[model samples]
Target chain A: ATQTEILDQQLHYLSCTLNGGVAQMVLDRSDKHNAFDEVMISEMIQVLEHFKRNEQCQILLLKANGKNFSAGADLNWMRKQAKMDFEQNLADANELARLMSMLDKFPKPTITLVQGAAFGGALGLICCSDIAIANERASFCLSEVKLGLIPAVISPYVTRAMGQRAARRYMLTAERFDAQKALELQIIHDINDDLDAAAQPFIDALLSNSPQGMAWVKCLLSSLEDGVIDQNTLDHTSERIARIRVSEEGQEGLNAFFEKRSPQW
Target chain B: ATQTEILDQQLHYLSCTLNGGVAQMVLDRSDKHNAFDEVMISEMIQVLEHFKRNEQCQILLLKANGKNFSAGADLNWMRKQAKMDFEQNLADANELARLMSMLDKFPKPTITLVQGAAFGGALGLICCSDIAIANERASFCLSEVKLGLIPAVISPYVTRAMGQRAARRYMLTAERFDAQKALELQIIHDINDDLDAAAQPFIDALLSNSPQGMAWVKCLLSSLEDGVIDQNTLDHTSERIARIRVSEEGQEGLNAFFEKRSPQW
Candidate 1:
């Protein structure tokens, strides 16, 4: 669906609305704690893909209708996977993995409003976002191994966000962790008793930075994190600083950095 | 050397003890605040290799006998490099980068204890660790950029752990962050009044999981975080879960999960 259609059509599994430059991708599955099945995953991928090229969409907010963020994969769908052949299971898993990658590599900043339970695959949703906030009562779990399956597809994002040590304990045991513990795990960036008040500043912070600079910083973050910083990566980083240091906009930004000024963007 | 031998062998600069499967690699250069020289680097690499293949060594603990965890490169080492030719500098940096990678890609879990100041390349050590703990009195800094030099060698692990935003501030400005701020910045995991008691629970939690599973989980985490989730990575992930679900240990763990009884490990 087109970005405009997402805003107007408002699909069954999810909904969206764009105001000013910010877009909200709302999860409307309150009945199931916003647990995603194939439909939701496909819808999410489409929304993210649309957001990729939409110039007006500077930031995307992930929201859900119910108390819990998500209940993870649909139970019946998971049962079907148990009986499916290896190839079918692989295909099924790949879709969700792709959805996660899309969220992670989105061009602009993304934030998630996390409440209640975020378990199994749902954990991947929050992990993929650039920033996330959970209320005091929100709970998180990586309950895949307990189901005779592993968090294989979501493991990468979860492990990176939470770190190896936390993943080792919770992914194996499927234990529920409180929001405060989740904060310490690096799973969520902020723990706000009032999530709304906390989320505004992040959006404001994103808006404050020059869009070009913010985009480049996003690119730089992922690049630096992904590989051995051999000569090529290191050279590129030096080039990045050099380019930003001398470019008309860069010079202005750095100069502006010293005074009350805006760049020649 | 055996555990007893490790303690007694005690090089003039560092120390260690292997007990009940936990191996502590202690930095003992208190007079220099545990700053590392080339000799110490060589010694550490050798110690890491031994731990890698040792059957009894499943968990590695990095400790320091001084007030600080590490002071990074020795003053003389930096001074030596200042006069080195281009090739010499490249060779020198590669050594530090290699050391950082070894700690990060270590086969088993690694934990670091942080106290006092961590500046320059020492920040990489805690970032490379699977888990790290710091107290209220601790501080961290990335002072490389303040010199003409950058944290080029250690950027991969540091950027991934502390994230893009925090790195932008600390690396660019050479600012010193307090322990409480370090916790917020994801530089350290927790704040501990009594550090020993806090650390034991993590070790105990790790001990409860299947050893084979833990190793594979570590492998999965780095693989996922370090590469593109293109079709090849996705394929590997799909294959991984499929293999783990049916593997001997995985099967036993899942079977035990269903029973009030522990399965055949």
Candidate 2:
């Protein structure tokens, strides 16, 4: 009964294909190096919204077509940004921030397969994913400070992914780093010649686990703040695992783990 | 006349030496591989409070007078934890959590010079430091899960420092990793044969910067949540950096930049 379901009927900048429990969202604007504009942002958000609601989608994969993964903001968009007033600029920033947040907090597992360039806002997209696999030739850069603009919207995710020390260095320097450097920074999980192959192990690992368990784990980790543990955190974390341990999926997963066999998810 | 001033008059678990603007806090419990208990936790909090109030103490250096940085919780402490009721266990966990938060939010720059083993809760101490440098042969582990326990209290700091993916792997596997893996995970900033020499560059960098500027940056970064930037974050960050630019130290830094001479802090 399962077939490739295209979530958005009139997508101009991106393509979505849902097969089985896996959903792949591809950036199709390779001519512009997958640089995003207002329309692309809106379209991508729409696709994500669809995926969020569709029960068939258990895993979300983000990748791009052609040589480069992304070159960040589109030229026309940057030009528009150049002339916008402070209020206007703030609005534009908020829109992109919304997309990043939605992707970050998406309930299901998300992955990004990167190749060629991942720059500026593109770096934000990569960091938001639960897992990121990059091709060996891929390159990354913050690329914001050079233009006299800070990576304000993306800074939180990027800083958290790379940690404060590396963020300070790369953000200030506006340096381009290779895949190996990205791996060292923990921005990308693995690097290989074939990103698709590289991602398979993670995909398999995720598919085999209880969906509820995975979701709960993600929620638990997201609820935490770096170095900010207190009574609330303790109670929340303790109560959360307890809730999961008693749930149907959690019970099955634990039983399966102890039994040394696959859980019937 | 600044000399080496002992902050605590009588210290059994740790030695505190304040020389110039730097306070070196050395864990002296080498007999137990610098493992910490309730008493050591109390003394550490006391020492930290002194450093917090002392205007002369601009930097805090945490190291140990032992072969290992720390083996985490003392054997006696763990033995006691085994027999304690739920209420008693929660209280003990809270005490450790308090130490982590205090060090993490310390006003001044904090650094850890790590050698040998940094296991279990010891990993928390390393992650809490603003900067951590480990010797080439240093080893690290999140050995909690292996003992049928999760790293609940230290999870936030450890997960943030190592990123979620790596934390999942290491925390679940309870694998012992070396300095290189720690660096790759962004857990430690650098690895070297001589921890003292490795720390010099970072110390010099901090010593050269404006204390107010440094403090403001830390505050701004801490206010952020991963992938949760919004109007408040945008406003807070924008306003914070603006406030600092008008500060006396900020003016001095800018003036010194143009004048080609070091400005007095």
Candidate 3:
């Protein structure tokens, strides 16, 4: 099947292509080490929203065309932020938050592939992903407190990704941790020298799964995140499985297992 | 300091000992393979409530006395429950949930040591713990879906511990995963052939940290769990760190670090 360019004219700092149910989004600013400003942030949000609505797009692969995955905020962007007050800073922060929140709750599977440095808000992007793969030499840093700024906007996702203990240490110390340390912290699922090759197994595994079932899994997990596990939660979980089990896709999956064949998603 | 026994006369299936700021609760029912029933459940809640209020008790060390950490629900208890209707079963499930919920929010750090087989509800206990260490030979199973019942009561804790992807596979298959796999799933912190020996480092580290600071960390993490990252969360996190930094203990810690000395806990 031929690949289709999803957004050619609208995107300036990013490139998006849809091929075989996978929408690959690349940060295309290598000269500045893929550093993102307001333009890149908005472009990413647009591409993510587009993929979320596309019927043909089943998975989103986020990667970068640079030695570094992302150097985080652009120099000019940070310079602009230096002059902003509380209200202005918050307004800008909300845009970055919106971009991360969208990727986090995106309706389909999202995979991020990383290399070299993934600093500051770049950590937020990786943490928001459903699956993340990093190159062996990849290094990461929170790097906010070093500049006398808290990682306020990205705290929740970053803390959840690395667990609380690690979050306390890294966020406070502003240390650079390697890919292996990131893996240990559960920040990335796997690390490989060949980043693209490492992502293939995940892609294949995800693509073979039932699309609707996968979406429901994401939905069910999000529902369970409210942190209350009571009778209502029990009933909702039971009803969810029951409804899916009787659905067309669920039945087809069961029938295929019995027939010793793959189900058509 | 002499070790003190708390609630010796009130307990039957459990033993509670407070030594050096640590409260050790051991599941002492090897004759029945440490499986819990209504009796054990109530006794655990009682001990936990006592520990929660005791100023001397700064940490919880949850362990079991048997070849296996736990076999989950007692066979006799299950047999009796088999004859019960939905109302009775739901009542029983709520008790288990209460026990787990209490452990999960016990205010201070909690560590669980696992060995051999930990099936069904046992997984819930480990997941609810702040730090979990397992023996090299230990194994775990959901074992609920196998009985045509979902892991409903423990779903929230289990799903969060192992993450959604692994939770889907393990819960659906009800397969036994080894200690390494449990580590990979982020269910347990570490694995060792000698579980007690392996926990020493973590014990040393946690004991040296300021008790109030650790408590604040747990409190902060729980507050962040509501899953909304906006201006309110940002303000709360900032306020929390600022308040703590100004506290006596925090000031002592910073001063001690600069002076090349250890702060008094």
Candidate 4:
């Protein structure tokens, strides 16, 4: 069987389906409480990378099944890592971190449907997506500290999502918090009784925008990360701006704003 | 009229009325669309520097007037700089950029109010401010690219506000966006029909908190900007977290959360 066939069969593990423009990936390891291990992480990266390359895919939805969103790194994986040599452990850990970072910087707009407990690495994954929706019953924690290990790998992207002060308290204490506190820290955008229903309006709103425009916006944002601007960047941005302003979509947008109409584009 | 009196009398230039606790500084040259020249930049620096030393001042509000917020660097100023000796122009531009950097990292909390168009150096000013509010009608552009220059000075602050990717597109393409787009980029915190009214709640919220607590929060944030959680930081943060969590306010907050009551503190 081909890789595509393998992915097709394995979709059941994630418990999600991909349509023309929208793809949904779920965590389905209910027996293990949906804890993520190396194979699952690799499978996830493969699926996401596939979607990233697929022209038909526009929006990706991530969620988990069972009683919890994730219990973070699988205890089995941790035990395996503990037996490995230092170099091997470092390489394995770094790869996982790198995957998380890639998700953090994913070009397309992504959303996470989080319910129940989102702990450890799972919380890191939640922080990575563009938008996150959680049920009010969801609980979160940075559990690395409690195990005498630090949240070193996930800290950068997580701290960037949640401000430093908030990260400090959670990272150090590994305290559990409810969805409301997560919203306060800007980790998740909203809390709802029904995750799917709550996320529909947002998904629809995102679909209303031009794909190219959204891509450009995301590209522009990537360049501004370091907080320094250079001449090349300025010239490039200026030309793009001019192009956008003169584009058909831009004109439609302007007209829509002025005429109180929605642009189909 | 004296410079101070002239500035003080220009109500159109300011969004928020000046109270003793918060000083309001407006870009007053609405006739030229509030473009900043060398003199204006110098005056701004002086005003901020003055406030830095004034014991009574708790915050500074930076705003502008008329149909436009600011067109950034005065085109006239740039035109002259283009004619100066290469080294001289470099020094001059660097000086302006330095001032902007200082403002961006200013110790005290700074707020920017944006209505209408914000262009060029004006956008830099927005990047420098700690919090920014824009009216629904507001539009923004990083116009430096058109002038064959980069947004070098404002890059650090802008990147900090919007992140690298978003900054790249705007800084390179010089595209314009509405207040809604700006909020997505994290450039501005809020957008509303009545910006001042919208801002009052935030101001009241900030003021309600203990000044020392606010200062510590800021300090803690600055320390953790890079997002690395090491042993020393862990130790320090644990102590600080405990201090705050055990304080009268913290105890009240805990009690409130458990008892389903509002915290008196």
Which structure among the candidates has the greatest lDDT? 3
What DockQ do you compute for every candidate structure? Answer: 0.19, 0.08, 0.09, 0.07
Better of 1 and 3 by DockQ: 1
Query: lDDT by residue for model 1 over A7-42, one digit each (tens)?
Result: 548677888877777888888888877877888888
Q: What order do candidates take by DockQ, descending?
A: 1, 3, 2, 4
TM-scores for all candidates: the values are: 0.66, 0.59, 0.61, 0.58
CA lDDT, candidate 4, residue A149: 87
**Candidate 3 TM-score over all chains jointly:** 0.61
Native-to-model Cα distance after best TM-score fit, residue A12 in candidate 2, in Å: 1.2
Q: Give the TM-score of candidate 1.
A: 0.66
Clashes of 1: 0
Candidate 1 lDDT at B58 equals: 67
- lDDT per residue for candidate 2 within B167-235, as digits (tens), equals 654553355789998997789999887889988888888878888887877776677635457898889
Give iRMSD, candidate 1.
3.8
Residues A1-265 of candidate 4: C-alpha lDDT, one tens digit per residue: 6444467577645655667567777788878878888877877877778778777667778988877898777888889977899899788778788779778766666779898988878877887777788998999888876778888877877887776678888888888999988886778877997999987875665555555566656556556544334445444455554455445665455445445676655
Superposed on the true interface residues, model 2 gives a C-alpha RMSD in angstroms of: 6.3
Candidate 3 stretches with Cα past 4 Å from truth are A1-6, A85-87, B1-154, B163-178, B184-265
In candidate 1, the residue pairs with backbone N, CA or C atoms under 3 Å apart (3 or more residues apart, or in different chains) clash, namely none
Top-DockQ candidate index: 1
Error of 3 at B121 (Å): 9.4
